[PDB]
Amino acid sequence: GSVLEQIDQGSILKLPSNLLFENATSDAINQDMMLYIERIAKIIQKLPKRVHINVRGFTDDTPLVKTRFKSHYELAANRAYRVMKVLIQYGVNPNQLSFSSYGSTNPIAPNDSLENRMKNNRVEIFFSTDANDLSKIHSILDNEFNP
Amino acid sequence: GSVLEQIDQGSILKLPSNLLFENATSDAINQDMMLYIERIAKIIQKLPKRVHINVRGFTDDTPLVKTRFKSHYELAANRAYRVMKVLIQYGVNPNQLSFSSYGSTNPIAPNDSLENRMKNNRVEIFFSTDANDLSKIHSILDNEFNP
Amino acid sequence: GIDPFTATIARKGEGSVLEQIDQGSILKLPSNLLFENATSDAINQDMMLYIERIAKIIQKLPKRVHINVRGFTDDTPLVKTRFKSHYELAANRAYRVMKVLIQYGVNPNQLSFSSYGSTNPIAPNDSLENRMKNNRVEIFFSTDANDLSKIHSILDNEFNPH
Amino acid sequence: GIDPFTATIARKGEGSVLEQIDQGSILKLPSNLLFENATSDAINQDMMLYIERIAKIIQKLPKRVHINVRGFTDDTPLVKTRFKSHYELAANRAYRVMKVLIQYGVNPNQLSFSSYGSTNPIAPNDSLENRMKNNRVEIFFSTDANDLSKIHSILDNEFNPH
């Protein structure tokens, strides 16, 4: 519910930035949230090795002052990287992990309200696989029938 | 090209009914097309066992007189069934085969021109798999995080 | 008519009614929830409450959703002259359920039916629930999305010319 | 600067530039087609012809397509103080290529970048093509479609209430 959402090519755990991090321009994780990341790490470790985990950082488009970060892309990158590193510290194999920065792109909801702007400041843990059976079927048929 | 098309959940070989069958209300395959079905059967036999083949019948919405068939669903069903049976005769395991009837539904193109009506009279051989890795991932996450 | 096994089977032992695969959703309807028996296409009119719900919930889905009614049998021998194969028997059962959905207000433009013929043998120690599942009708919900395919086509034409 | 291996490598031995997986398309760009070397984020300005084409073809795709620029390394040790990890090095390379796409007219609203850090060891008898592939940037084309997920949600809520 509040955390889990399904999309057609994988699953998403949505972690609000204001809950996860120390302040609005920080990439340090709140100590009382560390074992929630461990909880996620433990579930990942039980999944098949073929599952990939992409830790995705997003911001809204509120400009930020008095910070070392010079773009929403940089802030989002540092946040996603931090969460990814903690997953590794709690036992997830790095061969299953990547991080992404979306900056202010791909918002959950339009940046048209205070509620929506807060929704857009989040880290998403995206679970998927690199399934290619359909692609391989198509390539074989293409070889045969494409004149 | 003319025959092969990819969609996001599988591949399609499109066989025009006017080329494949004896006449507009017949389900008998033209003798000079039989080894084209064999050609398809041979490619299927080389694919992994996990591939399923659904032979899909479609019509346009031209009414038909002086026929034993009482609906587009019945005509489409008989045509798809015939092609499926020939695939079995040429060696495809029945455990990989089903047939479908769409009647006049799901047209390729709107029934607004002679060219489009002819396009809509076809049998599609649909190749896919019952992949469920993403569904299983989601079920595991749902167990854990849905309060 | 209703067979003494259709009549007696409890619902507790059934598998999950809803299954998900990566390309769509499946409502699995064992024979006894739809038909008088597993060897003909005669609808049990006294079970139609369940089909009405499905029709009702199908209105909460968009026009783009495709609904495919799928028929299965096991290796039970054919009883009636009118079914010449298990493929035919399963097609008739699926078609029948599809028509009930239409009767109950589902848009015919979104409906199709399929037949898988026999897909399971008769096995020693099979439960009655497993026999009813082997003669199920499924309602399969999917789309024919081709967005990702169109992307690949554009790229393949540009970077892999013949 | 350009390293004597970036400079010399032939294109004949490269793998396919375009790969398809079931969730999207991947353009695989070995290090030498983009950067002066495999250990820094300095773009080879003399290779930018190739990036311009990609930007050009990205306009033939719809707004709904998401473009993710992905950086990879192997276990080559870090050369520069400024990269503190392979994750950081790959992120910087990916970010750099993403910015070139923006320069060349790709809508920033469709762009993101990723880093996979090191994903391959240094192996005996590796070709130079394989080293360049291990330090590639990928452009990954996908969507966040949720049509099938929304169908399942509706059905699960109705038939599997808590």
UniProtKB/Swiss-Prot annotation, chains C, D:
A single MF term (Gene Ontology): identical protein binding
Protein family according to the UniProt entry: Belongs to the MotB family.
Cell compartment(s), UniProt: Cell inner membrane
Domain OmpA-like positions: 22-145
Domain of life: Bacteria
Keyword Amino-acid biosynthesis carried by entry: no
A biological process term (GO) from this entry: bacterial-type flagellum-dependent cell motility
Subunit and partners: Each stator complex is composed of 4 MotA and 2 MotB subunits. 2 A subunits and 1 B subunit are thought to form a single ion channel, so that each stator complex contains two channels.
Keyword entries, A-Z: Cell inner membrane, Cell membrane, Chemotaxis, Flagellar rotation, Membrane, Transmembrane, Transmembrane helix
Protein function: MotA and MotB comprise the stator element of the flagellar motor complex. Required for the rotation of the flagellar motor. Might be a linker that fastens the torque-generating machinery to the cell wall.
Membrane topology reported for the UniProt record: Single-pass type II membrane protein
Protein name: Motility protein B
CC per GO annotation: bacterial-type flagellum stator complex
Periplasmic side: 7-162
